[PDB]
Amino acid sequence: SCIQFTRHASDVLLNLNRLRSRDILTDVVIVVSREQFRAHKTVLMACSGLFYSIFTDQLKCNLSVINLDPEINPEGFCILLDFMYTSRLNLREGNIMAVMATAMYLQMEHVVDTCRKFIKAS
Amino acid sequence: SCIQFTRHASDVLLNLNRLRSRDILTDVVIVVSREQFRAHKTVLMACSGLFYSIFTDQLKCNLSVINLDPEINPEGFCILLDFMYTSRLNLREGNIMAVMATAMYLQMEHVVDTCRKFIKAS
Amino acid sequence: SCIQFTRHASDVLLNLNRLRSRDILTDVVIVVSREQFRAHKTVLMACSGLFYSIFTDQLKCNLSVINLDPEINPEGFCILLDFMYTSRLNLREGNIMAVMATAMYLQMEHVVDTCRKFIKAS
Amino acid sequence: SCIQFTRHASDVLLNLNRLRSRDILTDVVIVVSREQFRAHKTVLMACSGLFYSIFTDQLKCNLSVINLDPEINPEGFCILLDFMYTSRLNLREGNIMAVMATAMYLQMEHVVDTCRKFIKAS
Amino acid sequence: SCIQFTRHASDVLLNLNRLRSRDILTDVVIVVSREQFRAHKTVLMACSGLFYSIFTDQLKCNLSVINLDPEINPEGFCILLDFMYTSRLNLREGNIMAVMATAMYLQMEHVVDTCRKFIKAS
Amino acid sequence: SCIQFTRHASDVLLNLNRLRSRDILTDVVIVVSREQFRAHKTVLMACSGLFYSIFTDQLKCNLSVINLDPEINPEGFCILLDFMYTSRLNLREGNIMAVMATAMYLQMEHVVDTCRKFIKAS
Amino acid sequence: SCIQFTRHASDVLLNLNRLRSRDILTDVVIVVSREQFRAHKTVLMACSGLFYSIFTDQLKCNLSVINLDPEINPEGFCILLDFMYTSRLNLREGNIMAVMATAMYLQMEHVVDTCRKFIKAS
Amino acid sequence: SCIQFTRHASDVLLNLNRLRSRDILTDVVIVVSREQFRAHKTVLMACSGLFYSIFTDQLKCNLSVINLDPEINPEGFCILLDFMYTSRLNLREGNIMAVMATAMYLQMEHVVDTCRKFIKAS
Ligand SMILES: CNC(=O)COc1cc2cc(Nc3nc(N4C[C@H](C)C[C@H](C)C4)ncc3Cl)ccc2n(C)c1=O
Ligand SMILES: CNC(=O)COc1cc2cc(Nc3nc(N4C[C@H](C)C[C@H](C)C4)ncc3Cl)ccc2n(C)c1=O
Ligand SMILES: CNC(=O)COc1cc2cc(Nc3nc(N4C[C@H](C)C[C@H](C)C4)ncc3Cl)ccc2n(C)c1=O
Ligand SMILES: CNC(=O)COc1cc2cc(Nc3nc(N4C[C@H](C)C[C@H](C)C4)ncc3Cl)ccc2n(C)c1=O
Ligand SMILES: CNC(=O)COc1cc2cc(Nc3nc(N4C[C@H](C)C[C@H](C)C4)ncc3Cl)ccc2n(C)c1=O
Ligand SMILES: CNC(=O)COc1cc2cc(Nc3nc(N4C[C@H](C)C[C@H](C)C4)ncc3Cl)ccc2n(C)c1=O
Ligand SMILES: CNC(=O)COc1cc2cc(Nc3nc(N4C[C@H](C)C[C@H](C)C4)ncc3Cl)ccc2n(C)c1=O
Ligand SMILES: CNC(=O)COc1cc2cc(Nc3nc(N4C[C@H](C)C[C@H](C)C4)ncc3Cl)ccc2n(C)c1=O
């Protein structure tokens, strides 16, 4: 029928991370407490339900700056943003809770499920 | 060390295709002869060298409409655009040449290589 | 007698999906909770009994907007809409139930039967 | 990965033929010489390049009546219309030429190729 | 003596199906539950004993609309109507019973006999 | 796939001939010189191009009486009418010419072709 | 001495069938259950012993309507009536018994003998 | 398919001759000069074109007495009437001309043709 490229998706994500690192076409600024994170809206929606709900709304599509609640832990967010573009989650006993709570706020069900298995195994 | 998500990249690409189908955050219009194709700039760069060279240039970053040469075969382009978001390439004896030529124009080396293996095996 | 084209139907469905992706002649908008899905009435009737019962009625034939119950899970619907145009069903343990319930609401007996075999085998 | 439905496409085409027979959602009238044929625009585009080129144009999308050249043989057209919805082509020595010429006008490359093999074998 | 045309009857039936598809001289409307089916009275009598008994009666000859019992399964009827004009019966495990029961109601002894052999072999 | 009934079409034609013999639902009177022939419009169209062209016209659909040119030989017409309902053509050296000429007038190409082969072999 | 016409009798029977089909000089109506059959008294006597015994009687000669017992199967009678005028008997496993019984009632010894050989060979 | 009775037609004609000899159901009187001949209308039409043209007319159907022109030779007529019921023509040099002329008047083309071959061979 057709031909399946097993590593295509990983190559795409890698190139997207390269563009993000170089600030190419990063159309949104995420403000967490005092920190700023530039990212691509499409990747945020693809990996986050909260960002999906926000950017799906035509009233918040064109929003250049997204101000999250100051309560969200920056370490939970930046670890998760790196994971979103790399698929590698830096989960350790010192940040597991901040990450789990942030994944809950960002509606990353599979991430929360893995934080649940993490403290279940540890 | 860390945990590898084998199917994360495919889930990301699938959600990106869902956004494209729903016209969510599609910031560019590709004009091929008389046809129009809305897509995401980041995915185009991630999968195409030509689009990478174009959108890497700060002069052509913010271009909302990209007019390709009218010589480019639309079937080669739309099959390739679907493959870019799905990783499945609809290559058949009736379109192999249009696809190979378009992949050459779009600088999709692995696609051209597979078109080479296709007619080599057929 | 005559000549059977084994791959004709798949080529037809593929071209129909290409038109849907390009919003060509999509005459209906399906409203699920807050999401909108544009599709072709004929394909919906061809693959769904509920849509068949609706569009068969001359009172609901010309309805441009179909508002489904807000209870229907969007993931069940969009996975099923893609399957309707592609014949490929993305059934995984995380969405099997939403899909089974939606196929029941949409009256997709063979889909419900396959969801039954899925959890029977898993 | 996923589950392939080998007979789904045939069931879809069969239901589409059932709707056409019952005049359900047939949005176009094809006028060939003195004869009228009601069909679905999406199926016509899916199986015909000429109808694809016509209905792809936004100026001819909403055309309810398509007047073909009076030179087109009705037997070539109706045999082909039935084949489009059934995948069964009624090709016999008495109509092969009218069908081949009509498939050429309708841009049905695989049909013309089969008419070529027909007189090549007969 | 004379000359036998082996394929004449099939050509006649095919042309009759073409007229039915084009609604030419279809003088009767069959109402099954909420569905309507236009057909030719002569073909119905030729293939059905029930319709023979009905249309043989001079009181029900000129009846333009025939209302069958709402209990008759539409899939059994439409599959059988297509078979009546095509000689091809779409009998599968999912509809065998509806077809057998409808053939019994329509008095299609050979069809019922084949439904008997179907479940006997399956 | 499905089941082919090799003798269904012959059984249908036989029952149609039985109805014609019993004057059941014969909706048209064919006037040839001084003779009258009652037949079914659908069978006439199915077997004759002239009757197809006539009854296809909505102006001549509902015509209860069809007056043919008085020049048409009645033996050519009645032999052909019997053949139309029986598939058996009574072609002999004494009537071959009247039949060939009538088949030409009625546009029965295969009949004319067989009259051509008849005098070619005799 | 004289000249024997081998095919005269068949030509006579054929013309008699043509008159019967056109209702010319058919002086009797045979009522079988709810069905009516118009035929010629002379042919009935020539081929049937029962009709011979009836029409030989001067009391039943001029009877315009002959009411047979409602028990006689119409398929046995009409197949036999066609055979009487055509010499071709449509004997199949589905009607052999109705025909044999009717030939017995009509006193068609050679027909009953052939029904005996039929089930003897089958 | 079916079974052909080679001698059925001769047995029918023989029984018809037996009825004529016994004056059973002879519904017409043919008056030739001073002679009277009782026969069956159906046999006359079956073997004679003149009688066919006469009895086909509804005005002359029910005529109990048919007065032929007094010029018609009785020997030509009675020889022909016997031949009509027996298929044996008593043609001898002393009556050939009266028979040929009568067959011409009665429109018995094959009889006239045989009278032509008779004097051609003698
Ligand atoms: C390891 N990965 C994870 O943990 C991510 O899991 C999740 C991902 C996720 C993605 C999105 N983004 C989109 N969602 C849709 N759709 C709406 C979905 C509810 C159903 C689907 C049919 C369409 N379309 C387009 C985007 Cl970009 C929305 C919500 C999401 N939620 C709630 C998740 O739990
Ligand atoms: C099955 N897949 C294929 O066939 C695709 O193969 C190809 C993909 C491809 C991707 C891009 N896109 C980006 N390229 C970079 N970089 C510049 C590259 C030359 C080297 C890399 C280090 C950075 N950054 C960011 C994007 Cl989005 C550019 C050119 C490409 N060419 C030439 C390919 O042949
Ligand atoms: C993998 N595929 C599946 O699971 C789909 O299975 C089903 C498909 C399905 C399709 C339709 N659509 C039409 N149905 C008719 N007819 C009415 C049918 C009940 C019988 C048929 C004779 C005509 N006509 C025209 C359309 Cl477009 C209606 C109901 C359906 N139901 C209930 C299914 O369960
Ligand atoms: C047995 N089957 C055959 O013989 C049919 O073969 C053919 C089918 C055919 C179908 C269409 N219809 C569509 N075509 C596109 N695309 C444009 C194509 C040139 C390339 C493709 C990528 C998109 N999109 C959507 C529809 Cl509905 C257009 C032209 C076609 N031509 C030229 C064929 O020769
Ligand atoms: C694959 N085909 C099947 O399964 C169809 O089998 C059957 C066909 C069928 C046809 C008709 N239609 C006519 N029947 C007569 N006659 C009355 C018959 C009982 C006997 C016959 C001599 C005349 N005349 C004119 C028509 Cl149009 C009536 C009843 C029938 N029954 C009961 C069947 O079982
Ligand atoms: C042994 N048989 C023969 O010799 C009969 O051959 C012929 C049969 C014949 C039948 C019809 N009747 C119909 N014709 C159509 N169509 C229009 C046709 C030209 C093409 C077809 C696609 C639709 N539809 C519905 C009827 Cl009822 C019209 C013309 C015909 N001509 C010209 C023949 O030469
Ligand atoms: C294939 N053909 C068969 O199966 C038909 O076989 C039969 C034909 C048959 C015909 C008639 N009809 C006439 N019978 C006489 N005669 C009285 C006969 C008993 C003897 C004969 C000398 C005169 N005269 C005038 C007519 Cl129209 C009477 C009875 C018949 N019986 C009993 C048959 O079994
Ligand atoms: C050895 N035999 C001969 O020589 C007899 O040949 C002839 C027999 C003959 C029979 C009849 N009788 C019928 N003719 C028709 N039809 C009208 C015919 C012209 C054509 C036919 C289709 C129907 N129907 C019903 C009867 Cl009973 C009429 C005219 C005939 N002519 C002109 C003959 O030359």
UniProtKB/Swiss-Prot annotation, chains A, B, C, D, E, F, G, H:
Q: What induces it?
A: Down-regulated during maturation of dendritic cells by selective stimuli such as bacterial lipopolysaccharides (LPS), CD40LG and zymosan. Protein levels decreases upon genotoxic stress in a dose- and time-dependent way.
Domain BTB, by residue range, is 26-93
Q: In which tissues is it expressed?
A: Expressed in germinal center T- and B-cells and in primary immature dendritic cells.
PTM: Phosphorylated by ATM in response to genotoxic stress. Phosphorylation induces its degradation by ubiquitin/proteasome pathway.
Q: Where in the cell is it found?
A: Nucleus
Domains (record comment):
The BTB domain mediates homodimerization. Its dimer interface mediates peptide binding such as to corepressors BCOR and NCOR2. Interaction with corepressors through the BTB domain is needed to facilitate the rapid proliferation and survival of GC B-cells but is not involved in the T(FH) formation and BCL6-mediated suppression of T(H)2 and T(H)17 differentiationrequired for GC formation.
Q: Which disease is it linked to?
A: Chromosomal aberrations involving BCL6 are a cause of B-cell non-Hodgkin lymphomas (B-cell NHL), including diffuse large B-cell lymphoma and follicular lymphoma. Approximately 40% of diffuse large B-cell lymphomas and 5 to 10% of follicular lymphomas are associated with chromosomal translocations that deregulate expression of BCL6 by juxtaposing heterologous promoters to the BCL6 coding domain. Translocation t(3;14)(q27;q32). Translocation t(3;22)(q27;q11) with immunoglobulin gene regions. Translocation t(3;7)(q27;p12) with IKZF1 gene 5'non-coding region.
What function is annotated for this protein?
A: Transcriptional repressor mainly required for germinal center (GC) formation and antibody affinity maturation which has different mechanisms of action specific to the lineage and biological functions. Forms complexes with different corepressors and histone deacetylases to repress the transcriptional expression of different subsets of target genes. Represses its target genes by binding directly to the DNA sequence 5'-TTCCTAGAA-3' (BCL6-binding site) or indirectly by repressing the transcriptional activity of transcription factors.
Q: How does it assemble?
A: Homodimer. Interacts (via BTB domain) with the corepressors BCOR, NCOR1 and SMRT/NCOR2; the interactions are direct. Forms preferably ternary complexes with BCOR and SMRT/NCOR2 on target gene promoters but, on enhancer elements, interacts with SMRT/NCOR2 and HDAC3 to repress proximal gene expression. Interacts with histone deacetylases HDAC2, HDAC5 and HDAC9 (via the catalytic domain). Interacts with ZBTB7 and BCL6B. Interacts with SCF(FBXO11) complex; the interaction is independent of phosphorylation and promotes ubiquitination.
Could you identify this protein by its name?
A: B-cell lymphoma 6 protein
- Organism the protein comes from: Homo sapiens (Human)
Q: What is the lineage of its organism?
A: Eukaryota, Metazoa, Chordata, Craniata, Vertebrata
